[PDB]
Amino acid sequence: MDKNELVQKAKLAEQAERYDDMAACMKSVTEQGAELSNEERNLLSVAYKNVVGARRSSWRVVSSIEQKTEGAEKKQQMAREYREKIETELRDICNDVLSLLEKFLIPNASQAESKVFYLKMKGDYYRYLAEVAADDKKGIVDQSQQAYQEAFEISKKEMQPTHPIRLGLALNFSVFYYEILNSPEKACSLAKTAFDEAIAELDTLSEESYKDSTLIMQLLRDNLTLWT
Amino acid sequence: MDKNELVQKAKLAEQAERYDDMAACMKSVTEQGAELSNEERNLLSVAYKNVVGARRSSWRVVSSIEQKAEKKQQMAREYREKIETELRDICNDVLSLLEKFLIPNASQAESKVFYLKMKGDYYRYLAEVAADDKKGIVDQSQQAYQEAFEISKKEMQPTHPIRLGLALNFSVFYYEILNSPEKACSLAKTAFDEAIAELDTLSEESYKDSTLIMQLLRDNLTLWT
Amino acid sequence: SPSFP
Amino acid sequence: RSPSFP
């Protein structure tokens, strides 16, 4: 299969909700080395969001059971071993994505929009490793923090405060501060400024992106309200 | 692992929504050859319902795209065939377990109806995707359902969830596979009315499933009318 | 048409 | 946990 065939098979897999097939198609598209179009970029992001998402969801359930069964020895060991199995899958998925970002996506991102998208993505998949990492953690946390910080600097300089990629990055960096670093105030401060800056310049909303923009602002405020 | 460990792993996989893992645990439990408890039977049924269900759902979508651009239509066809092969292997795995272990070891009527309904169900899934082998597959689903139906009407109470569930699926088979909406309606209506007439036979351990299936029986009757 | 389970 | 986007 050539690029166009793999992209078409990815769209079919998406419709069929076969996200492993979708991810394999887009992985192959990325390994051809050419810069991804906006469409291909979104197909890659959606595919892996769902592939890693099923493992993160399974991990959270099994971890909660493993915690809930402290007094039931047999059942807790069963839960622990299964959580570890899920973790190996989750790590392999994150390592696959971060390898694509480092080998192809980040070096070929010619425009600011793309660079911010892929650095945020790097920040995100290092954050998923950090969610399950328990001595390797500090290094993983630092790699997520460095990707997010670089993306944040470029977005504040090159993008309008209502751009969905700029808002989304502020949302996920904010989640990183709260969940991974346990800095609720630093998380709240980031989400609040992101929200207020966007409210002050709503005239900069594009018809092709206003739905994602307004959605992320609602999410930014939800996190601010929940962490307060 | 031992049976009890595999059953515990299956319950964990269920909670994690890892239905392939759940199905592998219960397949291994079944291959030990001992008659399944009611709990184990339900875990096996739920696991494979979800494993085959994902393929049936994917198949419906890709078939609809294939029906509704020459290059794109060939790809849709090839992808449907790939999904169909997975769906077939899943159905054959279940149907092999039923014939090698489950149906010959079912000593009680409750178990026999459960496994014959299951046989009816998995040949119905093959029939959904079969296009000259179809008639034989349809006949296998009809024969399994008919035998289970006869045994349920004789040995079980009209409110029993297994008897109600079987009447619901054989009714679905008549509507979807045999395009007989009037006998599908009669089968569902009699099942519903015979349950309503003997509600004093409801068990506290099974009334929730019973009343749920009655609601489903009436929904199908109302939709097919 | 819905079935059970 | 705390919702992210996408």
Q: What is the DSSP string of A58-109?
A: HHHHHHHHHHHTTT-HHHHHHHHHHHHHHHHHHHHHHHHHHHHIIIIITTT-
Helix (H) or strand (E) holding A50: helix A38-68
- In chain D, residues with a C-beta closer than 8 Å to the C-beta of A164 are 5
C-beta separation of A170 from A191 below 8 A: yes
Count CB-CB contacts under 10 A for residue B104. Answer: 12
CA distance linking residue A165 with residue A170, whole number of Å: 9
C-alpha torsion angle, residues B109, B115, B119, B124 (rounded to 10): 90
Helices (H) and strands (E) in chain B, counts: 10, 0
C-beta separation of B7 from B43 below 8 A: yes
Q: A123 CB near a chain D CB, below 8 Å?
A: no
**Residue A159 has what DSSP assignment?**
S
Of B12, B13, B75, the CB nearest to A12: B75
Asked whether the beta carbons of residue A46 and residue D6 sit closer than 8 angstroms, the reply is yes
Asked whether the beta carbons of residue B61 and residue A16 sit closer than 8 angstroms, the reply is yes
CA distance linking residue A134 with residue A141, whole number of Å: 11
The CATH homologous superfamily to which domain B1-225 belongs is 14-3-3 domain (1.20.190.20)
The identity of residue B5, as a single letter, is: E
Dihedral class, residue B163 (left if φ above 0, else alpha if ψ from -120 to 50, else beta): alpha
Residue with tokens 């493993």, as numbered in its chain: A66
Q: How far are the Cα atoms of B209, C3, C4 from residue B214, in angstroms, in the given order?
A: 9, 12, 11
Helices (H) and strands (E) in chain A, counts: 9, 0
Between CA B220 and CA B225, with CA B222 as vertex, the angle to 5 degrees is 105
Asked whether the beta carbons of residue D4 and residue A171 sit closer than 8 angstroms, the reply is yes
C-beta separation of A97 from A48 below 8 A: yes
CA distance linking residue B160 with residue B13, whole number of Å: 28
- 3-state helix, strand and coil shares in percent for chain D, rounded to the nearest 5: 0, 0, 100
The identity of residue A92, as a single letter, is: D
- In chain B, residues with a C-beta closer than 8 Å to the C-beta of A65 are 12, 15
Q: Which positions ≥6 away from B159 have C-beta within 8 Å?
A: B195, B198, B199, B201, B202, B207, B210
Q: Answer positive or negative: Cα dihedral of B195, B196, B199, B202.
A: positive
Nearest to residue B8, comparing CAs of A67, C4, A69, A57?
Answer: A69
Asked whether the beta carbons of residue B61 and residue A86 sit closer than 8 angstroms, the reply is no
Between CA B174 and CA B183, with CA B179 as vertex, the angle to 5 degrees is 50
Chain C residue closest to B223 (CA)? C1
In B74-213, DSSP assigns E strands to none
**Residue B201 has what DSSP assignment?**
G
C-alpha torsion angle, residues A99, A103, A107, A112 (rounded to 10): -30
CA distance linking residue A194 with residue A40, whole number of Å: 28
Count CB-CB contacts under 10 A for residue A31. Answer: 10
Asked whether the beta carbons of residue B16 and residue A75 sit closer than 8 angstroms, the reply is no
CA distance linking residue A218 with residue A197, whole number of Å: 13
C-beta separation of D2 from A178 below 8 A: yes
Nearest to residue B62, comparing CAs of B94, B85, B45?
Answer: B85
Count CB-CB contacts under 10 A for residue A45. Answer: 18
**Residue B138 has what DSSP assignment?**
H
CA distance linking residue A160 with residue A113, whole number of Å: 11
Report the gap between the CA of A53 and the closest CA in chain B (Å). 12
What b/e readout covers A145-174, taking b as 16+ CB neighbours within 10 angstroms? bebbebbbebbbeebbbbbbbbbbbbbbbb
Options 3.30.470.30, 1.20.190.20, 1.20.120.330, 1.10.3720.10; which CATH number does A1-228 get?
1.20.190.20
* Deposited experimental method: X-ray
Q: What are phi and psi of B58, to 5 degrees?
A: -65, -40
Whether cis (ω within 30° of 0) applies to the bond prior to C5 is yes
Report the gap between the CA of A169 and the closest CA in chain D (Å). 8
CA distance linking residue A124 with residue A165, whole number of Å: 13
Residue with tokens 């029986």, as numbered in its chain: B217
Residues in chain C: 5
CA distance linking residue A214 with residue D5, whole number of Å: 12
Can you state the angle between helices A73-100 and B3-16, rounded to 10 degrees? Answer: 50
CA distance linking residue A124 with residue A30, whole number of Å: 18
Q: Count of CB contacts below 8 A, A vs B?
A: 53
